[PDB]
C-alpha cells in the first residue's frame, strides 16, 4: 500500500487554480475591509480593526474568526 499512498495527488492545473484564487481572496479581503470602513474615501489608513470588522460583518469570512480575533 506504499504505491497507493501516492493517491489523491495535486495536479499542476490545481496548484495554479489554488494560487490564482488565493490572490483573488487577498485582494478581495483587503479591498472589502477598506470599502466597508471608508467607502470611496481615498488616502486612508487600513488598521487591524477594519479587518476584524469585515470578518465580523461578513458570513463568507466566517472561517477567519479564530485567525483574525477581535483584539490583536
Amino acid at each position: 500500500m506504499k504505491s497507493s499512498m501516492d493517491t489523491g495527488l495535486i495536479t499542476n492545473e490545481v496548484l495554479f487554480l489554488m494560487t490564482k484564487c488565493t490572490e483573488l481572496f487577498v485582494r478581495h479581503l483587503a479591498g472589502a475591509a477598506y470599502t466597508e470602513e471608508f467607502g470611496q474615501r481615498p488616502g486612508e489608513a487600513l488598521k487591524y480593526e477594519h479587518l476584524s470588522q469585515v470578518v465580523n460583518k461578513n458570513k463568507n469570512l466566517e472561517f477567519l474568526l479564530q485567525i483574525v480575533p477581535q483584539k490583536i
Binding site: 495554479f16 487554480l17 485582494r27 475591509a33 487600513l46
Partner: protein
Amino acid sequence: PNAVIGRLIKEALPESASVSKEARAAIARAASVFAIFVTSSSTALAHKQNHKTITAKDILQTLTELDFESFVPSLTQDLEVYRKVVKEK
C-alpha cells in the same frame, strides 16, 4: 507570502491608501487559512462525488459553495487560458 501579498494589498486598495504592519500580517495569515480551508473543502466535495483527485471543477464548485462565487468567472477564464498554453508545449 510576505512580499507578493504586500503587492496584492497595494494593488487592491486606492494608490493613496495605506495598511498597517498589523493589518498586512492578518491579511497574510488569512490568505493562508483561506487556502487550507478551500483545499480541505474541495477535498471533501471530491469525495462526495467519490472520485480519486481534486479537479478544477471541484475547486470551482467549492468556491461558489463557500460564497466566493464572484471569483469563479475570472478563475474560469484563467483556467481556459491555462489549458491552452498547456496544450502546446
